[PDB]
Structures are given as C-alpha cells and as structure tokens.
Design a protein around this ligand. Sequence first.
Ligand SMILES: CN[C@H]1[C@@H](O[C@@H]2/C3=C/C#C[C@H]4O[C@@]4([C@H]4COC(=O)O4)C#CC3=C[C@H]2OC(=O)c2c(O)ccc3c(C)cc(OC)cc23)O[C@H](C)[C@H](O)[C@@H]1O
Lengths: 113, 113
Amino acid sequence: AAPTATVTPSSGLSDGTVVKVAGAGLQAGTAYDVGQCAWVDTGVLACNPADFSSVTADANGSASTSLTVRRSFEGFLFDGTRWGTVDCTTAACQVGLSDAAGNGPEGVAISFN
Amino acid sequence: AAPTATVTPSSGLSDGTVVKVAGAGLQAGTAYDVGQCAWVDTGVLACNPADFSSVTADANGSASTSLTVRRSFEGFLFDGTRWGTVDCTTAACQVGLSDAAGNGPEGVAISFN
Ligand SMILES: CN[C@H]1[C@@H](O[C@@H]2/C3=C/C#C[C@H]4O[C@@]4([C@H]4COC(=O)O4)C#CC3=C[C@H]2OC(=O)c2c(O)ccc3c(C)cc(OC)cc23)O[C@H](C)[C@H](O)[C@@H]1O
C-alpha cells in the first residue's frame, strides 16, 4: 500500500497561499520535510527550501502540516546550490513530503491562478 | 521518490514464468515480501505464499529478485485462511512488494493467457 499525500487546495493558488498537506502510509516515528519542488531536468529536482515545513509521522504512518506556496521561486538543488528560478505557471510544480533518503509519497501537482 | 515496483515480463505469461521484480524508493535495510496476489473482495487480497520471496532493500533503497508466477494458485487471505483457487486469467492478479507494516509500492498488474 503506497504512501499518499493530499494538498488542499492544489489548484488556482495565489502566490502566498497557505495550503494544508497530509501524508499517510509514511514510516511511523520518522521526520519528513514538506515542500514545493519541480523537476527541472532529468533526475534534477529544484525546490523552494525557504518555505519548507516538516512533520513526524505518528504511529499510524500519518502526519499533517501547512505550507506557503510561491508562484515562482529561486530553485535550489539537494546540495544547497541554486539551479535557476522556477516559474510554476510554465513549469509543473508539486508539493510533497520527503524523508532524509528522498522517500515519501508521490508529489502532488499544483497550479496557480 | 514514491516507491516503485516494475515486473518484467508482465503479460503473455504462463504458469511457472519467472519474472524480475525491481523495487526502488524503498526503505534501506527493510525486508520486503515479494509475491503475487489477487483482489477478491473490496479491500481483500488473496495471495500465493507458496511462491513468495524476500528482499532486503540496499543502502540506495533498491531491491531486485525473481518471482515464479502462477496462472492459478490457492489464494490465502492475510491471516492464512484459504479463500479458494484464484484463476488469474479471470481474476485481477498483481505482483508487488510490502514490508511488515504493509507499506510499499503499488502492485503491478500481470496477465497470462
Ligand atoms: C535525498 N536526495 C535526493 C532528493 O532530494 C530532494 C530535494 C531536492 C532539493 C532541493 C533543495 O531544497 C532543498 C534544500 C537542501 O539544500 C538546499 O539548499 O535546500 C531540499 C531537499 C530535497 C529533499 C528531497 O525531496 C524529494 O525527494 C522529493 C521527491 O523525490 C519528489 C517530490 C518532492 C516534492 C514535491 C517536495 C519535496 O519536499 C521537500 C520533496 C520531494 O531528490 C533529488 C532528485 C536527488 O535524488 C537527491 O539526491
């Protein structure tokens, strides 16, 4: 049973909307970061770390938090370097959850007004 | 990195075909059952434990193993109760991976003829 994520709302977002993020099927007791990213190239994920939140999955594998989304952001790579700016009206941005190894539910697509 | 399972080959299968099951986005060091099952009721899987195999995910969260699939098998529910003979030409059989918490990739649909 695969882990899942919900991002409410996920469409028609304005810059600065705070969305609600919930996870299920996560690893009980484990800390997860929650954020907005986009795949900008094959295998290259650029994220918006300035607005990340985090959660610890409860004993049932569940967790929730909120997240401020940004219409465009300066995209950063896992090693702390900047990839370039990401415009989410022209790029497919997603909001998801990730543990220290990169694991978690599939990202949820989001879109802006 | 949501967990994934890939099963090769997955169609035109015969009784006894050995398939390769590759899992990724798994938990490093967790052991996973690898097996074939059919949904026989809402939220009820009847599996083939006689051919189940095991893999422990490596440091990169990957695993691979072979699995021998069956066109028909005695299907067992989660607690060992026999459900009855599953005929996979008629039933929706799938192959997948799950850990002791029942967590893992979604299963992969397979077809015999
Ligand atoms: C653990 N390392 C791998 C992972 O890194 C992801 C990642 C990328 C980036 C970035 C920078 O903002 C920072 C830090 C680190 O350095 C900085 O300067 O900022 C972070 C983080 C990350 C955490 C991981 O989130 C995710 O894994 C994740 C996902 O797989 C899919 C969608 C996601 C979505 C939609 C959101 C999300 O929220 C955190 C995570 C994911 O995937 C990369 C592609 C590489 O393989 C990395 O090696």
